[PDB]
Amino acid sequence: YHQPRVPSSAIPIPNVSGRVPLPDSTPVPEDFKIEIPSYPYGPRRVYHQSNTGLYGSALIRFGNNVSKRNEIKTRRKWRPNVQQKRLWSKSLGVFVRTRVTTRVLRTIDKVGGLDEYLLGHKAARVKELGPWGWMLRWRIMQTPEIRERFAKEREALGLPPREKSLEEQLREFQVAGIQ
């Protein structure tokens, strides 16, 4: 989709395919690519339309059409109620455009927002995210809000405090370009 530009972040919201093309203005070293970790459960072999949106666990379903009298079976299709909405992201601070079903819109409200819906670690949720939901999950992990929220949640779990982030690399390429 045509995503807004993050207010203070060089990194753009990933593309549907996974690529993160940087603008020509941003200086990039020779052969440098922003790669997103592979989706654990891999793409969805059927209904590739769901690999580019938040479809939860809904696919296109095939069944029969039954007549009133003779009950003659004819094959038909059931399609999920797929829409295209602009969802607010507190971490990014913009309106992430995406295709989301009406059932996942109620989940975004149930958990407290898109950011809370993308950070869920339960297996049932990582499967519902899909390749696209795994790219938005990776994106909000680069923001300082989530980075400063996960660092505070590690002090409660008795974990050592946590090397260079992706935002700094792009920042250092703008300095090295002038030298």
Binding site: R137, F150, E153, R154
Partner: protein
Amino acid sequence: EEQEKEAKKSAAKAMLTPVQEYNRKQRELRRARGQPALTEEMLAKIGEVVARNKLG
């Protein structure tokens, strides 16, 4: 060619949540504890129960 595939297979470890990283740290500590052992004194006391319930 394999070092870039094992690093590409374990590349999602930087996307872990604080809870996931906490559970993965406990297995290393739990696996390092080992298995408890039965001392000769505890084994001798178990034999009495076996003999008492088999021979009398």
